[PDB]
Design a protein around this ligand. Structure first.
Ligand SMILES: [Ca+2]
Ligand SMILES: [Ca+2]
Ligand SMILES: [Ca+2]
Ligand SMILES: [Ca+2]
Ligand SMILES: [Ca+2]
Ligand SMILES: [Ca+2]
Lengths: 88, 139, 71, 66, 85, 138, 138
């Protein structure tokens, strides 16, 4: 006598059991694919964010030239009026 | 794996005002000859199209699957204006009697993806810094 | 063996779920980097946004010094 | 006599003060795009962590037949 | 009864020659200023448009992830409901 | 003696691609002994993949201000359009010898000035024709 | 001998240029047979003053103290007047022959002494009339 803890197995008839063995792989394969599909989506958004950082740093370093250019021009215009009043 | 990898070193020097592309060595390249080895040489292409002086090539190594170039190249460009550009690194097998065999390639730029894009990113962030990394040839 | 009393045995498979833990670990990690960039992208904009206002002052100061010089 | 090249100065100054205003608009609208995406990432992780729990609470199985 | 002109001949030629140059050097710098301001502000506008591209083409990638996350919730729930018997 | 060219762009959602329209050119550079030229416009999109992405207009005869008024199509998604550039070339068709190069203009994200602003206003305004002029260079 | 001339120079700001003033000559050189002369002053701006820089005074009859009292204007900026040089010549008008050269004077940077002092004090003192006596010679 045995006592287990679905329970069947005596005479050969309708299976109804291979499904619960196949339907488990379907949920397992769709779970691995789900983990694979999420990894592809977030990795592509990571690279897309990197391609945006190189553009922000491009515009940032270009804004430094615009600010430094306004200072260089401001000094040059001051040297223009400074040398005009003393030498003339 | 498969077609091998290439050791590339990128650096932007503000004292020179240009990108310093360095081809150091390659490992496990694809044998494209009948003797079991290959004659590898690295060609560098940094331009989208009409380039006057953007085709750089390394010296052709003799019968080697693991070459060692230890070379550096210089591309003249404005102060960090390599975002729109993308460096294409190609490895070829030199054939005297026919067209050269294509071993593998590499793409470094904003158009790249994964390890190739990150190598191009860290080169533009830290100026006057030598950044080197391995890249798998082709896909 | 045979008909003893109270025993058990190892099937005897001398899986593919270590990936699921590895992928979800890499998924949840990169999402942390997505916040890292998005926050650092906003800090850079606010830096550049204040930088434009600082340029507009010097851009109008150069305009006045040109007008007061070219008569 | 031919000081018509002076009009280039006022034409450049008109564009300088104008493009700078476009820089002000581009930078402000750029921040609004990131602030919208930053609140979108917080919405993606909630749907991503929900997928993780729906997998762990499903990929736990001992109902196999030997 | 002070003094006659001493070292005034060559001094005057320096005050007049520089007045010719210093008056036109200021006008030339006013022309270079507007050109330098253009080459910087215009180039910064181009960098702002290239950034607006990579940024707006990133929001569509986040939309592919969010809509991709919900597409996975369907296939996960469809696998759980199907796994009953 | 470089000239301009009128280019019209639009992304058709119904057709599913880019509509490049070459209208006309003004004050083109002469490349024939008779003071005129036989101009036609070539089109070549940036080949991120390997396929035929070429388009050519008809060949006008003896004119420096042609009037093509033609349109061309490229079946590419709107998402994959920012990563490409359009190369517009004007040539002087010769019968015996090879054709001469008159002008050229590239429109893309890597462009500059109006050559970039024209390509950007199409990525932001879909199903709306954007026609603007561009100066031909070497 | 050879004569002395009284010249008044002034740069007018509201009028925009130099106001040259030929006033009076004293003891000019005799260049005729009757012992006198028919003088007239011809001032010239030689530093590349392109279109019409040769102003001449009216011809006086047989005289020994010619009082011209004529003023002339030169539309030029104060900046570019420093590199200038005014050549003031005096001639004797003859009937049916060429004019005899009585005297001459030069005012500008090339000058020296009283001639350079006159050209200097006018550019330094704007809106002020400066008149001095200069000696004529070959
Ligand atoms: Ca071979
Ligand atoms: Ca070979
Ligand atoms: Ca021809
Ligand atoms: Ca022809
Ligand atoms: Ca006489
Ligand atoms: Ca006479």
């Amino acid at each position: 006598x045995x006592x287990x803890x679905m329970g069947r197995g005596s005479e050969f008839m309708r299976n109804e059991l291979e499904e619960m063995q196949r339907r488990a792989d379907q949920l397992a394969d769709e779970s691995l694919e789900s983990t694979r599909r999420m990894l592809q989506l977030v990795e592509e958004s990571k690279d897309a964010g990197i391609r945006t950082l190189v553009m922000l740093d491009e515009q940032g370093e270009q804004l430094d030239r615009v600010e430094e250019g306004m200072n260089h021009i401001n000094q040059d215009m001051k040297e223009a009026e400074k040398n005009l009043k003393d030498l003339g | 794996e498969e077609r091998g990898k290439i050791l590339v070193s990128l650096m932007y020097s503000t004292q020179q005002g240009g990108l310093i592309v360095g081809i150091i060595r390659c490992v496990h390249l694809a044998a494209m000859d009948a003797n079991g080895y290959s004659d590898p040489f690295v060609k560098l292409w940094l331009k989208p199209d009409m380039g006057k002086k953007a085709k750089h090539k390394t010296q052709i190594k003799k019968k080697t699957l693991n070459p060692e170039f230890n070379e550096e190249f210089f591309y003249d460009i404005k102060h960090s204006d390599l975002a729109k550009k993308s460096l294409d690194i190609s490895v070829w097998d030199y054939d005297i009697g026919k067209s050269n065999d294509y071993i593998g390639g590499c793409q470094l730029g904003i158009s790249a993806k994964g390890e190739r894009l990150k190598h191009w990113y860290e080169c533009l962030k830290n100026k006057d810094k030598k950044i080197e990394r391995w890249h798998q040839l082709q896909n | 063996x045979x008909x003893x009393x109270x025993x058990x045995x190892x099937x005897x498979x001398x899986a593919r779920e270590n990936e699921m833990d590895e992928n979800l670990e890499q998924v949840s990690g990169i999402i942390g980097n997505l916040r890292h960039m998005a926050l650092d992208m906003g800090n850079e904009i606010d830096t550049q946004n204040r930088q434009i206002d600082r340029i507009m002052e010097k851009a109008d100061s150069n305009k006045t010094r040109i007008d007061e010089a070219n008569q």
